[PDB]
Amino acid sequence: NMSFVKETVDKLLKGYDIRLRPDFGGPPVCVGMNIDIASIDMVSEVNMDYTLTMYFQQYWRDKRLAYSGIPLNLTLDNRVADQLWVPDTYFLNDKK
Amino acid sequence: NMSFVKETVDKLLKGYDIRLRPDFGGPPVCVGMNIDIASIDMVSEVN
Amino acid sequence: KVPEGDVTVILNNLLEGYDNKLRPDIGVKPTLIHTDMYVNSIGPVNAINMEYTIDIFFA
Numbered sequence: 001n002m003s004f005v006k007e008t009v010d011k012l013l014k015g016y017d018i019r020l021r022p023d024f025g026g027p028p029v030c031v032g033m034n035i036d037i038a039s040i041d042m043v044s045e046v047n048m049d050y051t052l053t054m055y056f057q058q059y060w061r062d063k064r065l066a067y068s069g070i071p072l073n074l075t076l077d078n079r080v081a082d083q084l085w086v087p088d089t090y091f092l093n094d095k096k
Numbered sequence: 097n098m099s100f101v102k103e104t105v106d107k108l109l110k111g112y113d114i115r116l117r118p119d120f121g122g123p124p125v126c127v128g129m130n131i132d133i134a135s136i137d138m139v140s141e142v143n
Numbered sequence: 144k145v146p147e148g149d150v151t152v153i154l155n156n157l158l159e160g161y162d163n164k165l166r167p168d169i170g171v172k173p174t175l176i177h178t179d180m181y182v183n184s185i186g187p188v189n190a191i192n193m194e195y196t197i198d199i200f201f202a
């Protein structure tokens with residue numbers, strides 16, 4: 001069972017172009033976002049800013065990362081994010 | 097000679113396993129230590 | 144004891160095809176991790192910010 005996961009992951013990451021978004025040239029990729037607020041620390045009047053800790057989660061479909069034959073969802077090591085396209089989300093009113 | 101030193105350094109660094117201490121199976125490696133104090137620039141009782 | 148070359152070949156043959164992306168016993172059973180902690184010191188308690196500092200060795 002292990003070697004099947006080896007082959008599947010290696011096949012998925014083989015020939016993957018991080019520079020191109022999913023469905024490049026096609027319709028826009030839909031990204032579903034949710035947040036879980038852990039705390040709001042310092043609402044400062046003098047600075048005009050609020051500090052906020054949160055778990056920020058994004059969901060998007062990618063045909064390149066589709067696999068079959070494994071009936072379970074794969075939780076990979078976080079560093080694999082360096083080898084994958086991720087949306088360029090950012091917070092506009094951020095100070096730091 | 098200059099070149100003698102130049103390839104001597106490369107000879108030294110070649111075949112060197114960083115992952116193992118000197119005398120890996122032998123006695124412990126002795127590490128002497130010196131400290132040259134430049135300055136103590138702060139002593140806070142608060143912290 | 145044994146030559147340094149023996150430990151070197153053992154070390155470089157340890158990795159081989161490892162693929163650290165995958166956890167041990169993936170798709171078989173949960174990976175059991177035993178946690179150990181040594182509290183070097185519990186730092187100052189900042190009542191203003193509702194926090195406290197702590198220094199630990201975590202294994």
Ligand SMILES: *[C@@H]1O[C@H](CO)[C@@H](O[C@@H]2O[C@H](CO)[C@@H](O[C@@H]3O[C@H](CO)[C@@H](O)[C@H](O)[C@@H]3O)[C@H](O)[C@H]2NC(C)=O)[C@H](O)[C@H]1NC(C)=O
Pocket residue numbers: 071072073
């Ligand atoms: C792999 O991950 C997926 C995504 O989380 C898992 O699918 C989701 O499983 C949950 C629990 O079975 C589903 O929730 C239930 O769905 C029914 C029908 O919609 C709803 O009436 C219930 O209130 C509850 O929400 C969830 O729908 C499902 N996701 C989708 C898109 O259908 C899946 O179970 C995971 N598989 C493994 C082997 O880990």
